[PDB]
């Protein structure tokens, strides 16, 4: 874990750079790109200078690629300017000019890079795979005309319907009964196995045999229950147990209930009193017969068709949708990723590796903490050896939060075990030194913070520029962390959230009033500026709880906006508003429909005006004439001109901006009219367009097309942002009330702890479920690190004695299963007093709390 | 079978696709006697006359040797009431059957129930 400098970084062989939060990943990637372009560093450099055509830099996000390409082009330009001027003010470029040998050839190389720079190898993984396949079509075995198709959900649903139709219809009533009890329909099946189907099909722990069928499984279960029913109906009728003070002598009711539970072997349910054959229950109330454990061993094993049906679906529908997509000629992102993986796994994979190594003898993967095992296998099989071909992996495992999306941290674990070079960075630009010291204390309060020694948190030092950052609220200064313990010692989640939301709105309104009167200063040395509503921000995990805090903020007259808006624009009132307007202008003769469309909030009229309009025959005739002319201009010149004419004639573009809150509605109308226009570009007919609009209203699609845009940057208000969309950004003042909360996981899907594979389990293994809980706690730790590092000046989370078990005040609180509880209580069940002591143990003039 | 006959009847534009597909859906692939009888009944419903006697069906032979192509099995099928009562598309009204036959008359069940409704209303 040597301290890293781009001046002395060895540009040879496999690497792994741990660039933490605010370490300038863009700055380092740009500097090392300049280093590879110039061939600088001497012994640590590549043996030859490289053209810009032979530099592969793949990055996760398309916007990240665009911004990175722009910044590196700017670096090329200003570096060539500094080389031609032989002087500069940037210390990096000054020492780079000290390191470069020949100014003339360096400047000519930079000119050639700048002119060839438009076609530099900077892609997303999906585009990069497609481009290599289009190059080596013969080696890849793929076609030539393929498109981008994103709606695999419909095809997955169709494949699920196909599987349910052809493997579940001729089954009898009793098998249908148990499968219907365990799940209702193909919608339920898709909702169960969608996350398993997406990505790569994982490894199933103890797969069922191929030849096992539903009828044979049902025969096994019915035999297994009728044997023990026969055994107990034979051996019924004797007593041995201890009649205790707790063990009542009227316990023969359970035996009589079992005797009446002897009914039939075609049922499925069993008695609660059947569980009283436990010798450990006898310890509260002498086995003497093997039945006392035969009942127990049959009870202790779960019996279902669930494993077999899940395995059949996951083995059939994937190849079914793959074959149907191949026949249709469509392609998916994971589909051609798997195509490249299979082509590399084939016997021509060595030829592919040779061709790719000769074309790009370098690759610089950005954001490695969110990568896929298929991607890592491709990278290993292509560039794992054969030097004169370098490979530099750059990532940051502490900010990998897309496991539900399909990421893996154990893939990074395997890569880190496979690579030798490890480095880190110190200059945390974005944060205050108080924040740096605070996060060092919080992640050093307990050894083994991440529950892994293989991902160690290295403390960092803030930049000397930002040492003057100090926070002032109402006169005196404030510590960098200031937690909040409410007026309670053990509380439920509802009143818990409501009270931190209420106090949150309290300090937010105090801070904004103080900034309005000039007392809450976000000040830097002698510089001092007030705090505004866009300066304060709050993080939250889920949208309903975001709405929960939003309700309190909008009740206390702080305007609030939710900048992780996943809602479609088709769900708001404007979509069906456009529906009645289009239906009324299609047939303007229907008085009832025309009146209904005219009486809405689209116009802005009043009930007295409508009532007077119902009687004025001449006014009715002239508005019929107006909408008839609108029908003429519709069927003559398309969709938007009638809308433009209608708004311009009605002055509603003025009226909605005059009325408060109408801007949001009006920009929704503009967006939906635009999207309606490129829908009607293909949809030449008008009734077809109406049917399409109705279909899209009845189906709330959640693609990127119908997402509502941000309202306005001119207006300033507090922003509610989710934790995932806050990745890679900054916020002056953050608020984290809800990270003390947690959620226990239950689904059986875990990763191998030594061999690093994804294990799909269908049983109730305690090792499986508690490994799942441990890695879920590691995930919550990673979100905690991300949330704490995304601050700038002052971060103030909420300390809470949260409880999930029904016992509210039992002495031992239930905070121990959250990230905050794990890093504060060291792994010990605590009380409110212990919480107070554990807080004040680390409290020294930088971390504190108030009621 | 006589599907080419029914489609050249379509192409002659003398009768209706309504009656053609009605005959197909009430005959299926069973006896050609039943098919042609249902075709004529559906046609006569196609103009809109509420009844039809059996004498018309056994005495017209519109544009084809209907009797010669309808005789198919053992015995003789001039007994049209038996030939149609053997089919499940014609019955005496005790069952939800398309064609009614009790008093030497064959027509739709809708017309039969409406006719008997107004008959017992007047009587």
């Amino acid at each position: 874990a040597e301290t890293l400098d781009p001046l002395r970084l060895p540009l040879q062989g496999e690497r792994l750079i741990e660039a933490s939060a605010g370490t300038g990943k863009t700055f380092t990637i740009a500097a090392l790109y300049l280093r590879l372009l110039l061939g600088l560093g001497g012994s640590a450099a590549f043996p030859r200078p490289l053209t810009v055509e032979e530099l592969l830099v793949v990055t996760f996000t398309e916007a990240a690629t665009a911004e990175l390409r722009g910044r590196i082009r700017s670096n090329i330009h200003e570096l060539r300017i500094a080389c031609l001027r032989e002087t500069t003010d940037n210390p990096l470029y000054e020492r780079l000019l000290e390191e470069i040998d020949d100014k003339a050839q360096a400047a000519q190389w930079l000119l050639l890079a700048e002119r060839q720079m438009d076609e530099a190898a900077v892609f997303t993984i999906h585009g990069f795979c497609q481009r290599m396949l289009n190059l080596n079509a013969f080696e890849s075995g793929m076609l030539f005309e393929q498109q981008l198709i994103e709606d695999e959900s419909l095809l997955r649903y169709q494949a699920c319907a196909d599987f349910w139709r052809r493997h579940c219809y001729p089954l009898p009533r009793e098998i249908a009964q148990v499968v219907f009890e365990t799940w209702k329909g193909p919608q339920a099946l898709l909702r169960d196995i969608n996350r398993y189907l997406q990505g790569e099909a994982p490894v199933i722990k103890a797969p069922p045999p191929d030849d096992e069928t539903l009828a044979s499984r049902h025969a096994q279960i019915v035999a297994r229950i009728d044997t023990v029913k026969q055994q107990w109906r034979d051996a019924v009728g004797e007593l041995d147990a201890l009649i205790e003070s707790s063990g009542i002598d009227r316990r023969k009711f359970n035996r009589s209930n079992q005797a009446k539970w002897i009914d039939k072997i075609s049922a499925w349910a069993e008695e609660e009193t059947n569980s009283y054959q436990l010798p450990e229950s006898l310890e509260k109330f002498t086995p003497r017969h093997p039945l006392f454990e035969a009942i127990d061993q049959l009870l202790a094993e779960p019996l279902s068709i669930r494993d077999l049906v899940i395995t059949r679906a996951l083995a059939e529908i994937r190849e079914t949708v793959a074959r149907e997509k191949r026949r249709r000629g469509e392609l998916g992102f994971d589909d051609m990723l798997s195509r490249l993986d299979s082509a590399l796994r084939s016997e021509s994979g060595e030829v592919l590796a040779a061709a790719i190594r000769t074309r790009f003898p370098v690759a610089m993967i950005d954001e490695f903490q969110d990568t896929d095992p298929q991607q890592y296998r491709i990278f290993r099989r292509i560039w794992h050896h054969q030097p004169e071909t370098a490979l530099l992996l750059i990532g940051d495992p502490k900010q990998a939060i897309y496991a539900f999306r399909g990421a893996d941290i154990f893939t990074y674990m395997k890569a880190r075990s496979e690579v030798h070079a490890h480095y880190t960075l110190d200059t945390n630009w974005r944060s205050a030194p108080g924040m740096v010291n605070s996060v060092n204390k919080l992640f050093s309060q307990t050894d083994d913070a991440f529950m892994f020694r293989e991902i160690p948190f290295i403390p960092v030092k803030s930049a000397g520029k930002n040492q003057a950052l100090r926070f002032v609220f109402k006169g005196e200064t404030q510590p960098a962390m200031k937690m909040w313990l409410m007026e309670g010692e053990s509380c439920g989640v509802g009143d818990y959230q409501s009270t931190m939301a209420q106090v949150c709105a309290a300090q937010i309104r105090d801070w904004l009033q103080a900034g309005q009167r000039g007392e809450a200063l976000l000040m830097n040395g002698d510089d001092a500026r007030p705090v505004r509503a866009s300066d304060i921000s709050v993080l939250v995990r889920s949208r309903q709880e975001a709405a929960q805090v939003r309700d309190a903020l909008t009740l206390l007259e702080i305007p609030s906006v939710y900048l992780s808006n996943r809602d479609s624009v088709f769900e708001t009132l404007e979509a069906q508003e456009m529906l009645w307007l289009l239906q009324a202008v299609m047939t303007p003769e229907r008085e009832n429909t025309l009146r209904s469309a005219l009486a809405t909030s689209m116009m802005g009229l009043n009930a007295l005006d409508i009532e007077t309009l119902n009687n004025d025959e001449h006014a009715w005739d002239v508005v019929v004439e107006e909408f008839d002319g609108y029908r003429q201009i519709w069927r003559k010149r398309g969709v938007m001109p009638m809308l433009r004419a209608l708004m311009s004639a009605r002055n509603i573009a003025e009226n909605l901006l005059a009325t408060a809150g109408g801007e949001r509605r009006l920009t929704d109308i503009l967006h939906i009219s635009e999207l309606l226009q490129e829908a009607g570009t293909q949809l030449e007919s008008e009734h077809a367009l109406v049917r399409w609009l109705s279909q899209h209203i009845l189906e709330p699609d959640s693609n990127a097309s119908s997402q509502q845009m941000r309202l306005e940057s001119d207006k300033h208000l507090v922003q509610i942002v989710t934790i995932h969309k806050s990745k890679g950004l900054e916020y002056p003042l953050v608020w984290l009330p809800f990270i003390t909360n947690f959620r226990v996981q239950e689904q059986a899907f875990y990763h191998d702890r030594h061999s690093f594979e994804a294990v799909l389990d269908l049983n109730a293994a305690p090792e499986s479920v508690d490994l799942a809980e441990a890695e879920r706690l590691a995930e919550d730790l990673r979100l905690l690190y991300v949330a704490l590092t995304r601050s700038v000046w002052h971060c103030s989370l909420g300390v809470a004695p949260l409880v999930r078990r029904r016992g509210d005040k039992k002495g031992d609180t239930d905070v121990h299963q959250s990230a905050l509880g794990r890093l504060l209580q060291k792994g010990e069940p605590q009380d409110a007093a212990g919480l107070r002591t554990c807080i004040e143990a680390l409290c020294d003039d930088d971390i504190a709390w108030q009621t | 079978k006589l599907q080419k006959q029914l489609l050249e009847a379509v192409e002659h534009k003398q009768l209706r696709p309504l009656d053609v597909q009605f005959a197909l859906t009430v005959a299926g692939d069973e006896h050609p006697a039943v098919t042609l009888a249902a075709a004529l009944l559906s046609h006569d419903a196609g103009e809109g006359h509420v009844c039809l006697p059996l004498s018309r069906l056994e005495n017209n032979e519109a544009s084809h040797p209907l009797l010669a192509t309808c005789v198919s099995e053992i015995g003789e099928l001039q007994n049209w009431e038996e030939c149609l009562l053997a089919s499940q598309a014609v019955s005496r009204g005790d069952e939800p059957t398309p064609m009614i036959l009790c008093g030497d008359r064959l027509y739709l069940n809708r017309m039969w129930c409406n006719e008997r409704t107004v008959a017992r209303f007047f009587n």
């Binding site: 916007a63 665009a66 013969f138 052809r166 193909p186 845009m709 | 597909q21 009430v26 069940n109």
Partner: protein, 981 residues
């Protein structure tokens, strides 16, 4: 195949082959051999003998014998062996020693505008030039030679003297030292050219002028019009003409600090302008406004003289048409759209392509109905737009979602359910025309009793259409040779299309496209069969390829993409699609091409052509130039950079000039300043009558705000019904249960059989298939049977009575159906709704005011029960008189009463222990939390807040309207809670 040199092709093809891969490979190989023959035919000449050319990369070892076998095969067929590559050289040898004018040759020829010709063609013109007169019109932006340099013996030949037309001769300045020093480089081309614009963009032009100057039989003159350095665009043209450099670099501190050596720029120049826009819609809006701006400013300008260039025409043209049609008449300017996708009769083209996808379609009902939506098919099979609504409702309620026939179903390895198919639906339609719903099933099919009248011929016509579709989907499945494919096109078009006036253009186009394709197939003499998939996507590929370069100079503004080999001078030129990654249009080669692995002087790529087009587009401007690109995507407000070409141009502008104010500050300050300078972005009248029907009171109170809309101002928000689903319902949710649930309930109220009613639904095709419907049926049986025993034991035979009262001076008329002597017994399978007990509460008072001693009871599912005691006549009217007042109050004003959410609020506050209202804030705190939970729904249930009636009156809830809804509810919701038992 299998020559031990086609191993990778065998690997590619032998995995799977439905001739699609073969078709793609044939098209790409034909394109590559066309490029080979037109550019570098020496390789073909060597391949004819059977050898390769050294220095060439991979894949030549199979690209050569493929061409050898191709020429051998086409010689074996009896076709002519003559072509361009083996005739041009013999043409040269024949022409170089002959007479002056062999007969048939034209007197003279002309070439204008062409800036890229093959070297073989230029050699042919060079040899042809010794006979006739040929004029070459090339437009190079500079005057002096800016080309490359080959060898020292070649620069000696470069002293050819270029005359003018009449007066004297002229060439590049400083003859000796330019060729002496490093200007003409020892191996590389010229690098001291000055202008980096030319140096980076004239890649094609440099090799072109080098090839043109390399002809020994040349006669080169020039007519170079000078340019006046007055504005920015003319200064740029002068700098690109005279081949100099004006970019300041800061050689020392003095040069870096002093900034007067450039030319100052007019602060009000409107020639070259840069713009940044968020969306293309706003971009074209700004373009329209600025277009109207300089059209207003310059009277000596016409829209005919102005052009607009786009990167991708398809992504921009709807915006162009939309804004220029929505432009008002007083601000109108004409527009002409060219080079876009030739889309003439798009519905009939879509119908034809979907028809060619017949033998593999699953026959979605919505898909086939959208196919039927074509008016040509509608007129051919005499089904009218009036009949479309009938057919939509019939195929909705009969529930047709899946394929046409059981054979079609079983061909896709699926169980023949015999239901939800098109044949099933037509059978249900005709049996419903024959029968009645009360009769029941006939062949396990329920009869659909809506279609009974004269309107029944539409489904017969639809059945004829579906029979034709089944016949043709059986016909088109088999793969046959092209001789069998010859007449099926004509048969298809006449069978499924009625030739009308609008149809004839598409008729002729489809016929000639198919005829051309099968004519190519006949000319090449295919022998084997071919599946329909190759013909379909080849028709698609030859139908989408045809653009329209027709309307160019009609008089409106010109909208066209930057087509290669097209540079025409105008006054104002606008640029669109200058974003990063989209322009220049990148296109990776075919991979196995040898031109990318070995270049030459006569190279032409898409990127080079785009750069050359942009450079002569900059040349083409005379008065104004407009630059625009998307810089800030409004979604995430991320920063997006412009293209490399425009970035280089704006950097040159920044490094070449300075604002007149800040003369000598710094080069960086000057360029930042000029970059900032060039970049910009209610009481109502009502009187209560004395006659009120009881149903009017019933319809009023069930939803107060809805009743306000739907009779007073006669407004109902009757939106369209939901779209037909794509799948058979495997599960039943929503309103689908309620109709099935209620009719099952009424069977057990009379204690009649339910097995008959079960098979009736089983014939109707609404239940899930197999035992699943039966299992779901059992769950509904065991829940109604629990509910039935509660109803049956309290049920006595009653009868209806007519009610006629008079309260508040208002007569009340109506009917009270099926009341037994102990009171009212009603049942409805739902939950305890406030309006539900209220609905019987209205019926209870009218029975109790007109005598009639007896309490009223209500039974529901999940053990719910509403029960109200009876009162005397005087107390019954007293509550009713207030409720009659609630009508005329609600009639005039939209009374703020939530039915259920108001009831949920008052349930907590009202206490039956003291039989009064509470006022303690702790219980009032519970009421507010319960109100929002009653107003806004849970994760799955729909709250009363999401209602279109309530959404019109307000969008948010204020604390004063919070109490206002409560206060009006508390007046009218007191009798239900105070009398509940």
């Amino acid at each position: 195949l299998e020559r031990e040199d086609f191993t990778l092709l065998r690997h590619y093809l032998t995995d799977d082959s439905d001739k699609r891969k073969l078709f793609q490979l044939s098209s790409k190989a034909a394109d590559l051999f066309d490029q080979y023959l037109v550019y570098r035919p020496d390789w073909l000449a060597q391949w004819e003998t059977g050898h390769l050319v050294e220095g060439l990369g991979e894949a030549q070892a199979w690209q050569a014998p493929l061409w050898k076998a191709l020429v051998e095969y086409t010689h074996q067929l009896g076709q002519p062996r003559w072509h361009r590559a083996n005739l041009y050289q013999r043409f040269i040898e024949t022409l170089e020693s002959a007479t002056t004018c062999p007969p048939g040759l034209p007197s003279r020829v002309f070439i204008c505008g062409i800036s890229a010709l093959p070297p073989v063609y230029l050699q042919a013109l060079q040899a042809l030039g010794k006979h006739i007169e040929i004029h070459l019109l090339f437009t190079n932006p500079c005057r002096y030679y800016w080309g490359d340099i080959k060898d020292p013996a070649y620069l000696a030949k470069l002293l050819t003297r270029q005359r003018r037309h009449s007066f004297e001769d002229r060439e590049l300045p400083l003859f000796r030292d330019s060729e002496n020093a490093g200007q003409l480089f020892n191996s590389d081309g010229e690098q001291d050219v000055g202008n980096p614009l030319l140096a980076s963009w004239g890649k094609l032009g440099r090799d072109y002028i080098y090839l043109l100057s390399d002809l020994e039989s040349s006669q080169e003159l020039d007519a170079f019009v000078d340019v006046t350095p007055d504005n920015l665009l003319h200064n740029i043209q002068s700098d690109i003409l005279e081949l100099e450099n004006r970019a300041v670099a800061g050689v020392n501190i003095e040069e870096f600090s002093r900034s007067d050596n450039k030319r100052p720029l007019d602060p009000l120049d409107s020639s070259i302008t840069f713009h940044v826009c968020h969306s293309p819609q706003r971009e074209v809006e700004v373009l329209h406004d600025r277009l109207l701006a300089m059209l207003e400013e310059d009277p000596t300008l016409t829209p005919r003289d102005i052009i607009v260039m786009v990167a991708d025409i398809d992504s921009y043209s709807p915006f162009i048409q939309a804004v220029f049609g929505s432009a008002p008449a007083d601000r109108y300017l004409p527009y002409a759209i060219s080079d876009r996708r030739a889309r003439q009769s798009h519905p009939v083209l879509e119908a034809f392509i979907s028809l060619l996808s017949l033998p593999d379609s699953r026959f979605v009902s919505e898909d086939v109905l959208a196919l039927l939506d074509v008016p040509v098919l509608a007129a051919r099979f005499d089904i009218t737009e009036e009949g479309l609504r009938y057919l939509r409702q019939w195929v909705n309620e009969s529930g047709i979602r899946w394929g046409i026939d059981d054979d079609n179903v079983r061909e896709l390895e699926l169980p023949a359910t015999g239901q939800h198919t098109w044949r099933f639906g037509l059978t249900r339609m005709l049996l419903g025309y024959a029968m009645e719903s009360a009769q029941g099933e006939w062949q396990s099919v329920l009869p659909y009793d809506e279609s009974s009248g004269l309107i029944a011929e539409l489904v017969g016509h639809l059945a004829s259409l579906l029979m034709q579709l089944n016949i043709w989907r059986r016909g088109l499945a088999q793969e046959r040779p092209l001789e069998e494919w010859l007449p099926v096109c004509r048969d298809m078009l006449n069978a499924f299309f009625l030739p009308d006036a609008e149809t004839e253009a598409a008729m002729t186009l489809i016929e000639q496209q198919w005829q051309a394709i099968i004519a190519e197939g006949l000319g090449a003499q295919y022998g084997d069969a071919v599946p329909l998939s190759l013909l379909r996507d080849e028709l698609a590929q030859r139908l989408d390829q045809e653009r329209i370069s027709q309307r160019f100079l009609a008089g409106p503004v010109n909208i066209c993409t930057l087509m290669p080999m097209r540079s025409i001078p105008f006054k104002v030129v606008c640029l669109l699609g200058m974003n990063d990654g989209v322009y220049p249009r990148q296109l990776a080669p075919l991979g196995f091409d040898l031109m990318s692995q070995k270049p030459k002087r006569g190279d032409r790529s898409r990127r080079d052509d785009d750069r050359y087009l942009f450079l002569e587009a900059l040349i083409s401007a005379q008065q104004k130039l407009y630059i625009s690109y998307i810089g800030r995507s409004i979604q995430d407000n991320s920063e997006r950079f412009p293209s490399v070409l425009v970035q280089e141009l704006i950097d040159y502008i920044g490094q070449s000039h300075y604002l007149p104010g800040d003369e000598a500050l710094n080069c960086d300050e000057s360029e930042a300043r000029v970059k900032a300078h060039l970049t910009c972005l209610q009481p109502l009248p009502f009187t209560l009558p004395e006659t009120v029907p009881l149903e009017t009171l019933q319809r009023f109170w069930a939803h107060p705000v809805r009743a306000f809309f739907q009779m007073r101002l006669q407004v109902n928000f009757r939106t369209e019904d939901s779209e037909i689903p794509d799948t058979e319902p495997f599960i039943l949710e929503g309103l689908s249960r309620y109709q099935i649930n209620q009719q099952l309930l009424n069977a057990l109220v009379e204690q009649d059989d339910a097995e008959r009613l079960f098979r009736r639904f089983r014939a109707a095709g609404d239940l899930p298939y197999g035992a699943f419907g039966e299992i779901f049926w059992e769950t509904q049986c065991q829940e109604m049977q629990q509910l039935a025993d509660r109803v049956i034991a309290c049920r006595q035979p009653g009868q209806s009575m007519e009610i006629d009262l008079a309260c508040n001076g208002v007569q009340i008329t109506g009917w009270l159906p099926q009341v037994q002597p102990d009171g009212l017994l009603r049942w409805r399978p739902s939950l305890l709704s406030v309006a539900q007990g209220m609905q019987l509460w209205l019926e209870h008072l009218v029975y109790c005011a007109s005598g009639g001693n007896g309490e009223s009871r209500l039974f529901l599912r999940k053990d719910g029960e509403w029960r109200f005691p009876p009162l005397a006549a005087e107390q019954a009217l007293h509550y009713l008189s207030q409720l009659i007042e609630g009508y005329r109050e609600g009639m005039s004003a939209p009374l703020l009463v939530l039915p259920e959410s108001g009831g949920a609020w008052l349930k907590t506050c009202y206490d039956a222990q003291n039989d009064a209202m509470l006022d303690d804030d702790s219980t009032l705190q519970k009421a507010r939390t319960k109100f929002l939970q009653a107003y806004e729904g849970n994760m799955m249930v729909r709250g009363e807040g999401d209602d279109i009636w309530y959404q019109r009156l307000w969008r948010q809830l204020t604390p004063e309207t919070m109490e206002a809804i409560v206060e009006q509810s508390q007046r009218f919701l007191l009798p239900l809670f105070r009398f509940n038992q």
